[PDB]
Write a protein that binds this ligand. Sequence first.
Ligand SMILES: COC(=O)N[C@H](C(=O)N[C@@H](Cc1ccccc1)[C@@H](O)CN(Cc1ccc(-c2ccccn2)cc1)NC(=O)[C@@H](NC(=O)OC)C(C)(C)C)C(C)(C)C
Lengths: 99, 99
Amino acid sequence: PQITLWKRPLVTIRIGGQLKEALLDTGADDTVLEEMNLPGKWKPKMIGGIGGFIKVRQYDQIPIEICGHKAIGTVLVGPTPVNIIGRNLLTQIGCTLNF
Amino acid sequence: PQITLWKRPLVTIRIGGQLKEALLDTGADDTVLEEMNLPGKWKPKMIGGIGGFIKVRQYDQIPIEICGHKAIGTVLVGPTPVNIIGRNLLTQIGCTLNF
Ligand SMILES: COC(=O)N[C@H](C(=O)N[C@@H](Cc1ccccc1)[C@@H](O)CN(Cc1ccc(-c2ccccn2)cc1)NC(=O)[C@@H](NC(=O)OC)C(C)(C)C)C(C)(C)C
């Protein structure tokens, strides 16, 4: 589909078979989800945004669907105010910017 | 153009006669540039992202040419880690997400 940018490009994602709303973010290197009690091993990571860095848990090879398109990759979990789909997953679903 | 996302979507912009590199950022409500001089009266404001809030200077009705496409809109200036073109200007240049 095509998504205009008049409002925040929020779309439905599925992780662990459950649904969330997330921002399709071309300014994000990584995918960062709001605190959730995801199972499995993880590694500590620090990621930086406009106001500084936060601590996240890095989970690898996690299946996700984004607007019905399947993807699999690294998902960071931490105290973000918004679920963010970053370029690591946007490439997998064939997402481009166009003007 | 059509821009894929295996790299950061940086483009050349012209603003106040000067050339800069900036990130086409669908996850940004606002356009935020690194500390610089711009003509006109600015209003103090605060914006937040991951890592928290920063203080910026809000300049209104500022022309920027973004990858050959003209826009005139609100530009925030402050200690952002990267020059960011947000949705306020992406809409002006007719930018959309597609997959
Ligand atoms: C409603 O608030 C906003 O729209 N906030 C925007 C904002 O922060 N957007 C974030 C997503 C977001 C939205 C709302 C609340 C919280 C977060 C991103 O679209 C843009 N941002 C812009 C940005 C991009 C890079 C960097 C950076 C950090 C350290 C070193 C180099 N670059 C900082 C900010 N990117 C990042 O922060 C990403 N960082 C990143 O990719 O780092 C490599 C994350 C996400 C992976 C953490 C602005 C402050 C830019 C206007």
